[PDB]
């Protein structure tokens, strides 16, 4: 992904203000609520019946912190996203068999959560920068399908 130097600055500046304990858990949480078919991959997580139960679930918040950690790991390695996500690409593709379209949906839900948390500050050019990032993370995680 070809990110403009001004876009690399805008991203890291916004990412340093991100609540690492809540945001990721909210992304995964909303993914499971907005797109219910994703819950079949998380049968061992517990009570996922109501929206409040998904968001309040301890296993969702905990795993969500790891997903956010993987997005932070990808922001430090923008030049080599394929190698950064190579191990995770094997897990999500060869083992779990998750359709690559869902990677793109989680990325878009992350963009929605960042919008929900920052408001006006998540200006249109900042979104444009994050869309390039989440699309790059998606393609990298979908490499074992190519």
């Amino acid at each position: 992904v070809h990110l403009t130097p001004k876009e690399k600055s805008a991203v890291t500046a916004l990412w340093g203000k991100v609540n690492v304990d809540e945001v990721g858990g909210e992304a995964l949480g909303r993914l499971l609520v907005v797109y219910p078919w994703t819950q079949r991959f998380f049968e061992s997580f517990g009570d996922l019946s109501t929206p409040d139960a998904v968001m309040g679930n301890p296993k969702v918040k905990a795993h969500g912190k790891k997903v956010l950690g993987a997005f932070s790991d990808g922001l430090a390695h923008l030049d080599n996203l394929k190698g950064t996500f190579a191990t995770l690409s094997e897990l999500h593709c060869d083992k779990l068999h998750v359709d690559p379209e869902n990677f793109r949906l989680l990325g878009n839900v992350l963009v929605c959560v960042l919008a929900h948390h920052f408001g006006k500050e998540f200006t249109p050019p900042v979104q444009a920068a994050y869309q390039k990032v989440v699309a790059g993370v998606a393609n990298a995680l979908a490499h074992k399908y190519h």
Binding site: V33, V34, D52, V111, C112, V113, H116, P124, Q127, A128
Partner: protein, 141 residues
């Protein structure tokens, strides 16, 4: 298709937009043009720069059509019948571009109404926008 709880959340969330409709629609359109540059080619007769009178004028039209869609939520195929013909036959818009504007509309709704953008309402609004998208992409020759 929708649910009676989905319709309640859509009417409640969009009811807090009200007067800010044109701003939100214009912002949604701007977020789309900047994030997905392929959508720009559908508006080559428009000034696509920030604060453009045209993007502001069209955003009002898109928002008003969505306001009419919230009104006739039980009969959307009949309400947006003129718009379906426009987007599918004449303009020949790629269905993917609707998923992108729909996303931008949700990002705008998230960035302006955080009290209303609860996980249940996010789901409701996504299903509403997907429904409006299905209608506008339906082409009956």
């Amino acid at each position: 298709v929708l649910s009676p709880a989905d319709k309640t959340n859509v009417k409640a969330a969009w009811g807090k937009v009200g007067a800010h409709a044109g701003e939100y629609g214009a912002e949604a359109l701007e977020r789309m043009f900047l994030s997905f540059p392929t959508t720009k080619t559908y508006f080559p007769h428009f000034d696509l720069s920030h604060g453009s009178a045209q993007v502001k004028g069209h955003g009002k039209k898109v928002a008003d059509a969505l306001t009419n869609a919230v009104a006739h939520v039980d009969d959307m195929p009949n309400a947006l019948s003129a718009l379906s013909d426009l987007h599918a036959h004449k303009l020949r818009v790629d269905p993917v571009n609707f998923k992108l504007l729909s996303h931008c509309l949700l990002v705008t709704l998230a960035a302006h109404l955080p009290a209303e953008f609860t996980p249940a309402v996010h789901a409701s609004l996504d299903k509403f926008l997907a429904s409006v998208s299905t209608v506008l992409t339906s082409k009956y020759r």
